[PDB]
Amino acid sequence: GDAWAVGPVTIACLGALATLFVLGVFVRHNATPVVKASGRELCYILLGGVFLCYCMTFIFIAKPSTAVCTLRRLGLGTAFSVCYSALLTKTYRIARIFGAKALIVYGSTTGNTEYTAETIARELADAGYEVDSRDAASVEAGGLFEGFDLVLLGCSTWGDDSIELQDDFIPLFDSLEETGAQGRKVACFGCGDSSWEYFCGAVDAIEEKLKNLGAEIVQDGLRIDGDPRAARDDIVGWAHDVRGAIPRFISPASQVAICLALISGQLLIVVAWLVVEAPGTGLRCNHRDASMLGSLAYNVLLIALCTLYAFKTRKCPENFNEAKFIGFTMYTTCIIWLAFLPIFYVTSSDYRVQTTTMCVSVSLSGSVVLGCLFAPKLYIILFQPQKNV
């Protein structure tokens, strides 16, 4: 009578041993760039989740009792939640540190502010910003700041007996109300000369109109004297605090925190369910998974939210394109869940079939995380150590 359990137990043991091997390779090479360069704590949380997926088999195969019924209810949702919260936090981290995007609008005649913007654009590019540099002469005011996390306005000072903004910049300055500067993080720069009474008067003028509109001036204006090439060290130095506006780093403790919050969401659903509907029997558990689908809905949200963010952040090259492999993991995950959920529905009337299918789908969900995400990571660590130094 235990024949039906041989196949699922074999998968579960092979899968558990693979997950342990992956953890072993990772912990042995813990300070290595492949393991350190991304969400290290998140990849250990993820492995724990994959280990729990395989272990769920032993709970499905077990004879129903108060303890087994508790474990099943609590575990099915939790196992998945650990995986999909670690994965969502990984893509969320990628989306903040590389998702960030900046816009540079400059007004230049002799190419001085046009050079300042080029060297600023390079420094921001180096900080994982999708930088877009645009001359003011070829800029239309209406909704120009929309979609941008950071906006840098560059302008030289002109006018003989008084201050005057650079020729190309004036229309943009005149219709500044229309760009969407309210609540936007901004910073001004510009080239001028100290032989002139009002050194960089254009910067002061732009800073002040931005202030009235309700813009968030992150840093004080960069006012350069003479040739910008000789003040290059201060330009790049100014770029060090403008890049700071949108965080370029989420701390290891913060990653763990947001991941633990999302897992806690599942816990609260399935613990609250257990206290309302007391676990027990009388062959079968008292409260089936179909009696309350709130645990499943939460994991479907996590999968949906994750797959959205994974696709949006796919082209990121950080940590040997881990973003691409999270993509594959997630596209494969959707396919498993879209194929199995209808099977469970149309098969709900045969318990041994439900149990057996659950052993296959939960383990397959684990195997996909090991195959798409970890196997490529493993191949570099073990067979390409020169690429891991």
Ligand X SMILES: Cc1cc2nc3c(=O)[nH]c(=O)nc-3n(C[C@H](O)[C@H](O)[C@H](O)COP(=O)(O)O)c2cc1C
The span from the CA of 236 to the CA of 125, in Å, is 12
Options 6, 290, 375, 382; binder of ligand J9R; rule CB under 6 A = 290
Residue 299 contacts which entry, ligand X, ligand J9R, none (Cβ below 5-8 A, type-dependent):
ligand J9R
Binding to ligand J9R by residue 356, rule CB under 6 A?
no
| Cβ–Cβ under 8 Å, residues 65 and 276 | no
Q: With respect to ligand J9R, which residue has the nearer C-beta, 14 or 341?
A: 341
Q: With respect to ligand J9R, which residue has the nearer C-beta, 190 or 279?
A: 279
**Packing angle of the helix pair 66-97, 252-276 (nearest 10 deg):** 150
Residues contacting 39, CB < 8 A, separation 6+: 86, 89, 90, 93, 255
Options 41, 225, 289, 318; binder of ligand J9R; rule CB under 6 A = 289
Q: With respect to ligand J9R, which residue has the nearer C-beta, 313 or 354?
A: 354
Looking at 252-260, 306-314, 324-332, 355-363, which segment touches ligand J9R (CB under 6 A)? Answer: 355-363
Q: With respect to ligand X, which residue has the nearer C-beta, 239 or 246?
A: 239
Cβ at position 256, least distance to ligand J9R in Å:
22
Options 108, 299, 307, 329; binder of ligand J9R; rule CB under 6 A = 299
Residue 111 contacts which entry, ligand X, ligand J9R, none (Cβ below 5-8 A, type-dependent):
ligand X
Cβ at position 19, least distance to ligand J9R in Å:
17
Residue 15's identity, in one-letter code, is G
Residue 39 contacts which entry, ligand X, ligand J9R, none (Cβ below 5-8 A, type-dependent):
none
Site string for ligand J9R, 46-85 (x = CB under 6 A): ------------------------------xx--x-----
Contacts with ligand J9R by CB under 6 A: the residue count is 19
Cβ at position 104, least distance to ligand X in Å:
13
Q: With respect to ligand X, which residue has the nearer C-beta, 160 or 233?
A: 160
- The phi, psi pair for 99, rounded to 5°, reads -65, -35
CA–chain centroid gap for 40, Å, is 14
The span from the CA of 357 to the CA of 365, in Å, is 12
Handedness of CA 278, 280, 282, 283 (dihedral sign): positive
The span from the CA of 266 to the CA of 74, in Å, is 9
Which whole-number Å values give the CA distances from 34 to 28, 37, 41, 380, in the listed order? Answer: 12, 6, 13, 8
Cβ at position 147, least distance to ligand J9R in Å:
35
The span from the CA of 74 to the CA of 292, in Å, is 12
Hey, is 389 helix, strand or coil?
coil
Residue 112 contacts which entry, ligand J9R, ligand X, none (Cβ below 5-8 A, type-dependent):
ligand X
Q: With respect to ligand J9R, which residue has the nearer C-beta, 30 or 291?
A: 291
Alpha helices, DSSP H, located in the chain: 6-28, 33-36, 40-61, 66-97, 112-126, 170-174, 201-213, 232-242, 252-276, 294-312, 318-347, 351-369, 375-383
- What residues make contact with ligand X under the rule CB under 6 A? 108-113, 156-160, 163, 166, 191-193, 196, 198-201
How many CB atoms sit inside 10 A of residue 388's CB?
17
How many CB atoms sit inside 10 A of residue 108's CB?
23
Cβ at position 169, least distance to ligand X in Å:
10
Q: With respect to ligand J9R, which residue has the nearer C-beta, 22 or 303?
A: 303
The span from the CA of 116 to the CA of 108, in Å, is 10
Residue 249 contacts which entry, ligand X, ligand J9R, none (Cβ below 5-8 A, type-dependent):
none
Segment (H or E) for 185: strand 185-192
* Lookup result for tokens 């250990």: 44
Options 358, 369, 372, 380; binder of ligand J9R; rule CB under 6 A = 358
Binding to ligand J9R by residue 202, rule CB under 6 A?
no
Residues near ligand J9R (CB under 6 A) are: 76-77, 80, 289-290, 295-296, 299, 336-337, 340-341, 344-345, 348, 358, 361-362, 365
